[PDB]
Amino acid sequence: PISAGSLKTRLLAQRRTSGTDDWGAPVQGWSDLGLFSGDVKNDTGLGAIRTAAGSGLPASIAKYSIKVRSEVIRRWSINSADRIIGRLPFSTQEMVFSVTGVISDFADPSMAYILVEAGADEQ
Amino acid sequence: PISAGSLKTRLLAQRRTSGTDDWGAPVQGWSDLGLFSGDVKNDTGLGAIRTAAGSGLPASIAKYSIKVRSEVIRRWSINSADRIIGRLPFSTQEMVFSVTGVISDFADPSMAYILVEAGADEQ
Amino acid sequence: TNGNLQQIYYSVAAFLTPEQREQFSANVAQSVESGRTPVLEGGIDVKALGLNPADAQLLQSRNYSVESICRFFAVPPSMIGHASGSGIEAQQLAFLGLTLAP
Amino acid sequence: ALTLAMVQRHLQADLIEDDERSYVMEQLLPAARESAEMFLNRNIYSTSEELAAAVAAGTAGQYPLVTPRAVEQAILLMLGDFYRDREATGKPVSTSAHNLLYPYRVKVGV
Amino acid sequence: ALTLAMVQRHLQADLIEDDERSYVMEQLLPAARESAEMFLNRNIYSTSEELAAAVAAGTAGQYPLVTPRAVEQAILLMLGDFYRDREATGKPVSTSAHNLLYPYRVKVGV
Amino acid sequence: ALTLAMVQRHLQADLIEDDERSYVMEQLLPAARESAEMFLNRNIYSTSEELAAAVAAGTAGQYPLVTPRAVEQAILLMLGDFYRDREATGKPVSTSAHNLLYPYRVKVGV
Amino acid sequence: ALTLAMVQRHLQADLIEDDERSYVMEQLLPAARESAEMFLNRNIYSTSEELAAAVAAGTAGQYPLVTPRAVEQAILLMLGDFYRDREATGKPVSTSAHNLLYPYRVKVGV
Amino acid sequence: ALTLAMVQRHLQADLIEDDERSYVMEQLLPAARESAEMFLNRNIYSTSEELAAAVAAGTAGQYPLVTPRAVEQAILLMLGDFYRDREATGKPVSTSAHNLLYPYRVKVGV
Amino acid sequence: ALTLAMVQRHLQADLIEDDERSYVMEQLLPAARESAEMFLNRNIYSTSEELAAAVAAGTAGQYPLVTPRAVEQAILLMLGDFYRDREATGKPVSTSAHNLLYPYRVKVGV
Amino acid sequence: ALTLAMVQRHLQADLIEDDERSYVMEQLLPAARESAEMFLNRNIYSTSEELAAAVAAGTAGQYPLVTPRAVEQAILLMLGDFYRDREATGKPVSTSAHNLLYPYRVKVGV
């Protein structure tokens, strides 16, 4: 029960180049992986967005969830250190998702859940 | 499934003039953007209003949610740094909303959610 | 030719192009000509319509019209039963003395 | 007029990738056009010049019409149905497209 | 009067983009107008000048009328139905637009 | 009396923008008035002087009445229905407006 | 007695604003009163003086009565129904006001 | 005995304001009394002296009774119904008050 | 055209692995194709060359056609049904693929 | 072709343990094959050489066929049903496998 055709969004998964710069911080250049399809589930309801983050620094972060077929998790290895780019229809501003982990289900081996952050763009 | 005709309220979106004053604080003058239509969803139930805020300073803040068509998010770019003005019918006191972020849905590309604050007027 | 004498009507729960209509009719004719039995696979169905050809053909009305014409021309409908007293010789006597004298 | 702009606007989905656009505009729209053209019991042509060409070549049958806007809307509805769900389920015949297409049917009979 | 302002206010939508404004005003409105025209069994014209011009050329059929407000709002209701749902789910044959359109129908019978 | 004040109070929505007011008072109220005037099988005029003028010009038909308050209330109910929902759905005939309008019907027959 | 105080207490509303007080007391109350008057098949007058005055001028029909309290509360119930819902949703023909109004009905039959 | 104390205790609402008390005791209780007195097909008087006065004046009809406690309870039930809900809905005839009032009906027939 | 790209876009699946691509394109697609072929009561061929070749060898039966787009999408719908559920739950006999396939059926009857 | 790869891909469960693989491929698949071969009222052989061998040995009955893809798909559906649930419940006869298998039945009669 995966019900194809609800996977109406074309995302773009991509990971980071290996190594470190002079200081040791992660390299702010991004490679490419490919394209897949998924069903995005929002957080409807009041108080679904987080404003403050840390030392009183303003923000606006709202977590989502992408349901993908089980093949995209075996072809690559998506984990917490990737980012996902999706573009809203007829728009030039593209959302940047930050993968916070992948939940896999054993009830049926045809689904997987990727939980993203979507709040602040990553570099 | 947007069901026009439930969008019975005429709001007024407007953003802030760029630059800073002598001290660097945001300029307290407000420009204009235009008018749109949306469906406002309250927070019914007890304890839906927040009284204290910080160093024991009294307040009364109750967050709302505006459901708008997908066009008003592509025409402009509404983010956390705007404010929305709406007027109650047959009244001279106008609510001032403070946008805290926009949630967009990918299940269908014909809706968007603007979460506002409505508690203390902005300047 | 109006189609008021038809008895059996087939029915299929789908949309068919006319060519399928001629094909269905030809298939029914072939099946009945070869001595087989209909089976009505799938969604096909048949209903029989409760008609009476005597009521379609108006036999009572036409009989009354015949009688009325005979009465109109002053010829008794039972004169010698030309339209539909024991002895025959009396029948001609009645015919004469009631219709032909004037 | 079944242009790429109209299809993109109807489906609310921009088709930038070449494979997806090829699928939608070469396997999915023509299927809806064929289905409507078969339900109407007549040939439909997009423009008058194509109808004249078909009449000249003799392939045009009885009662051919240039496509009006209602038939375009019904074809778009069928295309949206094809794009939304992609499995064979027990959906009923005489959907909402057949309500619009019905006055253009020609050889209705029994 | 089925102008752009009335359509904008009915749908509660701003048609700023050229593409979607063209879609709504050139493929979605004529479909509804000609669907109502087919249901009414008569031709409907916007103004008296168009009716007179059509009668002069003889292309106007018998029993023509210039559109009242009830027919215009029935057309608006059909357009609003077209904008909202974009599939072939299957609906009742007689909607709420036909209740408004019915008293202007002509040539009813068996 | 179908004044702007009465319409604003009924719909519970002030109409300050010129386009919205034009829509409501020039496309939406006249549609309800036409629909009620067609259901009643008679002509309705707001004031007695207009009725006299129509009689003089000869355009007034049989059984014309000056609009009572019940017909105004029913017209307002139809207007509120038009303003609330803007899509064609399977709503039933003989709504709650026809209960109020019914005693004023004139040529009921079979 | 259908004064302003009784209407204020029935609706649990303070009609301070001139506009909405005018609406409720000049378009929403006469509608209910004349609807009940049409249902009862007779004319109803507030006081004996008005009944005598109407009989003197001959405009009062046969079987007139001055309103009892039951008819006044039926009118109040109709007004309360009018205030609450402002659309044409579709309702049963015989409501709870007719149960109160029925024993005063006249000229019933076939 | 339909005293202010009994009404206050039944409705569970003290009536201190003059307008509210006037409404309840001059528009709402008499309506229930009239309705019950009309359903019973007979005249009901609170006390024997009033019945004798009515008989003397000749206005008392056939079968007049001094009100028993069951009729008081039924009148109170109708009053509570009037006080609770204030809109005309599709409530059914033969409520729970008519069960108590029924043995006192006089001219039941067909 | 029932290539690999169309199947990939229909199922929204990337068939990178050799094993599952072989499964889908060699056991799951021919099943649907021959099921539709059995339902249609005729043989269907991909291109004109294959039809001519089959007719030359005589193995092609009477009434053959080269596949239109509607039959191809019916096959795609059957394949999408096969991919989704993999059990024998029990389903209606006439699905949504048969509605598309029916106008091409031949040799119907009793 | 009822290979280990096809079975593993259909059931979405790799069978690495020897006991589980033995169970699935020696008690569960042959049961589905026997059930389908008994419902078809005919013998089915995987390959043509085996059919020729069976004909030579004389054990092949009337109307034997080499298994097409539809019968393979139906056998896989029955196998998936056997693998999913493992208790006897009140499931209905004529499941979704019998829809695919039915055109291959031979001795249907009464």
XYZ file of C-alpha atoms in Angstrom, chain I:
110
model
C 4.741 3.388 -26.172
C 5.253 1.105 -23.161
C 9.000 1.736 -23.088
C 11.087 1.763 -19.909
C 10.789 5.532 -19.459
C 6.981 5.491 -19.501
C 6.851 2.662 -16.964
C 9.372 4.471 -14.764
C 7.300 7.653 -14.822
C 3.990 5.857 -14.233
C 5.106 3.935 -11.148
C 7.224 6.846 -9.832
C 9.981 4.281 -9.309
C 13.609 4.074 -10.392
C 14.358 0.530 -11.533
C 18.109 0.676 -10.965
C 18.529 -2.841 -9.581
C 18.714 -5.499 -12.284
C 16.534 -7.938 -10.352
C 13.484 -5.738 -9.777
C 13.727 -4.098 -13.197
C 13.698 -7.586 -14.703
C 10.722 -8.507 -12.515
C 8.665 -5.457 -13.490
C 9.530 -5.495 -17.196
C 9.426 -9.261 -17.796
C 6.774 -10.774 -15.524
C 4.514 -7.903 -14.495
C 4.091 -6.058 -17.825
C 3.466 -9.059 -20.137
C 0.833 -10.291 -17.682
C -1.133 -7.049 -18.000
C -0.653 -6.887 -21.769
C -1.925 -10.416 -22.364
C -4.772 -9.939 -19.879
C -5.991 -6.936 -21.868
C -5.433 -8.921 -25.070
C -7.626 -11.742 -23.745
C -10.338 -9.314 -22.648
C -10.440 -7.498 -25.993
C -11.045 -10.732 -27.980
C -8.359 -9.691 -30.476
C -4.601 -9.509 -30.936
C -2.782 -6.217 -30.404
C 0.600 -5.375 -31.926
C 3.010 -2.566 -31.125
C 3.855 -1.332 -34.639
C 2.646 -1.793 -38.200
C 5.670 -3.938 -39.073
C 4.790 -6.518 -36.416
C 1.163 -6.603 -37.566
C 2.192 -7.149 -41.189
C 4.706 -9.830 -40.187
C 2.115 -11.682 -38.102
C -0.472 -11.522 -40.894
C 2.102 -12.852 -43.368
C 2.786 -15.951 -41.257
C -0.956 -16.396 -40.668
C -0.685 -16.552 -36.874
C -2.642 -13.300 -36.464
C -6.366 -13.807 -36.021
C -9.186 -11.831 -37.546
C -9.835 -8.255 -36.402
C -6.292 -7.215 -35.388
C -5.285 -3.689 -34.464
C -2.154 -1.785 -33.549
C -2.462 -0.412 -30.038
C -3.988 3.061 -29.614
C -3.064 5.194 -26.632
C -6.204 4.316 -24.656
C -5.379 0.599 -24.652
C -1.796 1.384 -23.649
C -2.964 3.418 -20.674
C -5.415 0.687 -19.691
C -2.448 -1.696 -19.665
C -0.540 0.843 -17.574
C -3.437 1.005 -15.106
C -3.512 -2.787 -14.797
C 0.249 -2.802 -14.191
C -0.093 -0.104 -11.539
C -2.735 -2.216 -9.820
C -0.420 -5.240 -9.955
C 2.498 -3.338 -8.426
C 0.553 -1.848 -5.514
C -1.213 -4.820 -3.909
C 0.263 -8.313 -4.013
C -2.493 -10.469 -2.522
C -5.846 -12.054 -3.390
C -8.151 -9.858 -1.321
C -11.131 -10.018 -3.674
C -12.207 -7.176 -5.943
C -15.072 -6.156 -8.245
C -15.070 -7.823 -11.645
C -15.277 -4.564 -13.643
C -12.543 -2.090 -12.717
C -11.649 1.314 -14.177
C -9.398 -0.228 -16.842
C -12.341 -1.977 -18.489
C -14.134 1.350 -18.955
C -11.224 2.481 -21.134
C -10.812 -0.885 -22.856
C -14.477 -1.473 -23.693
C -14.996 0.580 -26.911
C -12.290 -1.496 -28.625
C -13.925 -4.808 -27.681
C -15.073 -7.065 -30.519
C -17.341 -10.111 -30.903
C -19.610 -9.133 -28.003
C -23.032 -10.747 -27.730
C -24.842 -13.754 -26.291
